[PDB]
């Protein structure tokens, strides 16, 4: 499957793509404002994620740091990124269908649209100014808006027991972005697409 990753933000981002135990495609790349990078994701990929990283430095070997979404200091991510990270999430070719969503469960750094480029389903979007509106206790000093699990490490926020409800913090994310997961047991906002659809992830779709 192809995923065109487009940076419409006015700032550089370092796109990342992983299924947690491996890179997807090259795993990461710099995208200056306006640039597009198309990756190939193997059919059947389960639990894949795409995200943006901000304020990165990498040396000539691809090692460094980012302020949001850092994946073990690598340009080419093999693992998931450090919160806060707005997440484009997908599982492909699952009994004949693809499943896509956006999640704020690991916080928010960059606004995103995640849409099919082929027929048969809608896209999802979380493009509100969550960083600007972020509750004071969730603001990440390194940049972005942390989820409450990251900040407070409680069973209720982290849904450790499979028993949690919505919270004042989850409701903030849900108010700003109804179409994204705000906590682990949120009413799902997953979209079912035809198996083997192709996609576009756009950072800063509205500015």
UniProtKB/Swiss-Prot annotation:
Top-rank lineage group of the source organism: Eukaryota
UniProt-listed PROSITE patterns: THAUMATIN_1 (PS00316), THAUMATIN_2 (PS51367)
Disulfide bond sites: 9-204, 56-66, 71-77, 121-193, 126-177, 134-145, 149-158, 159-164
CDD domains given in the database record: TLP-P
Gene Ontology CC annotation, any one: cytoplasmic vesicle
Main location: cytoplasm
Gene3D superfamilies in alphabetical order: Thaumatin (2.60.110.10)
Subcellular location as annotated: Cytoplasmic vesicle
Keywords assigned: Cytoplasmic vesicle, Disulfide bond, Signal, Taste-modifying protein
Function comment: Taste-modifying protein; intensely sweet-tasting. It is 100000 times sweeter than sucrose on a molar basis.
Entry's family note: Belongs to the thaumatin family.
Official protein name in the record: Thaumatin I
Organism: Thaumatococcus daniellii
């Amino acid at each position: 499957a192809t995923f065109e990753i487009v940076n419409r933000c006015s700032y550089t981002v370092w796109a990342a793509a992983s299924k947690g135990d491996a890179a997807l495609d090259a795993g990461g790349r710099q995208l200056n404002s306006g640039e597009s990078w198309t990756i190939n994701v193997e059919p059947g990929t389960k639990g894949g994620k795409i995200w943006a990283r901000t304020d990165c430095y990498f040396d000539d070997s691809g090692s460094g740091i980012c302020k949001t979404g850092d994946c073990g200091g690598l340009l080419r991510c093999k693992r998931f990124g450090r919160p806060p990270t707005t997440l484009a999430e997908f599982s492909l070719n699952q009994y004949g269908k693809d499943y896509i969503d956006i999640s704020n469960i690991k916080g928010f750094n960059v606004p995103m649209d995640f849409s099919p480029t082929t027929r048969g389903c809608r896209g999802v979007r979380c493009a509100a100014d969550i960083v600007g509106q972020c509750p004071a206790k969730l603001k990440a000093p390194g940049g972005g808006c942390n989820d409450a699990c990251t900040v407070f490490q409680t069973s209720e926020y982290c849904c450790t027991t499979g028993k949690c409800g919505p919270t004042e913090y989850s409701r903030f994310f849900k108010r700003l972005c109804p179409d994204a997961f705000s906590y682990v047991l949120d009413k799902p906002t997953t979209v079912t697409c035809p198996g083997s659809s192709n996609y576009r992830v756009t950072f800063c779709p509205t500015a």
